[PDB]
Amino acid sequence: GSLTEQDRQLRLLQAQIQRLLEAQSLM
Amino acid sequence: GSLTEQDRQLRLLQAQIQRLLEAQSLM
């Protein structure tokens, strides 16, 4: 539960949102 | 942009949200 880990998982979340939106032709 | 791909990226998004929330001690 470190900030190191939270920060990593948040950035990976941001990437994965983008990946979905690109697959949807929205980004 | 297939549904195959959207469905995959959506499920990966769901997993990654969960991963963040577990790192945050919220799940």
Residue numbers in the entry:
A (entry chain A), B (entry chain A): 2 to 3, 726 to 750
Original authors' sentences:
PLK4, and this interaction targets STIL to centrioles. allows homo-multimerisation, the interaction with the PB3 domain of PLK4, or both. structures and interactions of CCDs and PLK4-PB3s in humans and flies. STIL/Ana2, which can then interact with and recruit Sas-6.
characterise this difference, we sought to solve the structure of the HsCCD. coiled-coil dimer of dimers generated by crystallographic symmetry. as an antiparallel dimer of dimers. dimeric form we observe in our structure. concentration and varies between dimeric to nearly tetrameric. reached that of a tetramer at higher concentrations (4000 µM). which is involved in both the dimerisation and PB3 interfaces. and binding to PB3 are likely mutually exclusive. that can readily dissociate to interact with PB3.
